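User: structure tokens for Phosphorylated protein phosphatase, please.
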Amino acid sequence: HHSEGLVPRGSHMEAQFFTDTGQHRDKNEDAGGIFYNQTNQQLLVLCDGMGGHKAGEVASKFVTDELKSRFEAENLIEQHQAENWLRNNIKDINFQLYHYAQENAEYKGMGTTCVCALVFEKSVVIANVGDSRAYVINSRQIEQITSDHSFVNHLVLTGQITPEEAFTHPQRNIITKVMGTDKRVSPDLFIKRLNFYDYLLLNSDGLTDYVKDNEIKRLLVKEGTIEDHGDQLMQLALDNHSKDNVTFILAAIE
Ligand SMILES: [Mg+2]
Ligand SMILES: [Mg+2]
Ligand SMILES: [Mg+2]
Ligand SMILES: [Mg+2]
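Assistant: Done. Predicted tokens:
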């Protein structure tokens, strides 16, 4: 009976993907993109391959390419089924990535984070594995929707350290949930209403490990196009001395 209802109205955001190796990593091990299904629904994908394990770029490209293949083959995903579609496809891809890593001795142990978003008229449905992020931003507030699967965030969430301490912690890079390392994964799923926000941001930690939320909001709330803001936001991460790959998708909410 939930499916006895009207088809989803067409809704895209103007969105663009930005990525840079940066000056301190051998490879760009981030990956991602903006994909469209056969009814022109939109999926945003960003993945941060693990630098401390082999073949991060293989893992992130694999998960991105799988999501692209799978979503472009789809016709329609109803709003109320979007969480299930993302959870089931992330779980499947994770299982496939686990075996790919186990079998190919050049890539043993590889894995990646994944944050992704399926866009609807009035809402976005986000799935998250790892410490890449999704935010909504307006002139008053910048809200992180996801919760990092990182060890320092476990310390924050148990009151062992403060957010500022986590930002400077020597173990800040360690992650607690990632694609490819185990046969099973439980992604976090979120639904966010879009009505009074101006931007949806998906990003790798190359951005937010060096640029605080306040700075991102101040940039994004000035007059500017998505191209201007993306170019400036990338420059800001570099000027803040990011030692990582920096990747993000900015999507303007109309
Ligand atoms: Mg990485
Ligand atoms: Mg590597
Ligand atoms: Mg991190
Ligand atoms: Mg990173």
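User: Anything notable?

Assistant: The radius of gyration is 18 Å.
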